Nucleic acid binder design. Structure first.
Ligand SMILES: [K+]
Ligand SMILES: [K+]
Ligand SMILES: [Mg+2]
Ligand SMILES: [Mg+2]
Length: 135
RNA sequence: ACAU
DNA sequence: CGATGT
């Protein structure tokens, strides 16, 4: 119903899908960019959306912040809930880096705890998520 | 169909 | 138009 303005918003950006993947997290209220991942040469949109949420969890935990995270990705939200990223992306030499990061993100989820609510950004009602790349 |  | 996902 109402945007929770005291929150962190994350989004993926890509050049191709599969293709070059990056992501960032912003303060929902102000748009201040709080973290940005160096582009990863090959990955999928959903792997990037997943990594963005997990990075947000790690970022907020490190700072003792109870803010929720907004993502517009039905898929990534579920993968985080399950602690399992069910990507179809072939595992080969060119996808090794993204798969290492995804594997490590799952490993972090399976060895840490958090209460952070992971909320669906309602793009149909609210417009684009504040972390959007505009591409 | 819905979310990207 | 194509691809990633539930
Ligand atoms: K965009
Ligand atoms: K589809
Ligand atoms: Mg998105
Ligand atoms: Mg976007």
């Amino acid at each position: 119903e109402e945007i929770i303005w005291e929150s962190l918003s994350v989004d993926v950006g890509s050049q191709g899908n599969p293709g070059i993947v990056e992501y960032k997290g912003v303060d929902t209220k102000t748009g201040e960019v709080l973290f940005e991942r160096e582009p990863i040469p090959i990955g999928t949109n959903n792997m990037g959306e997943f990594l963005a949420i997990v990075h947000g969890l790690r970022y907020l935990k490190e700072r003792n912040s109870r803010k929720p995270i907004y993502s517009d990705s039905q898929t990534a939200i579920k993968w985080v809930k399950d602690k399992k990223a069910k990507s179809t992306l072939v595992r080969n030499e060119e996808t090794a880096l993204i798969w290492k990061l995804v594997d490590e993100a799952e490993e972090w989820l399976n060895t840490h705890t958090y209460e952070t609510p992971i909320l669906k950004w309602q793009t149909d009602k609210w417009g684009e998520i504040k972390a959007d790349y505009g591409r």
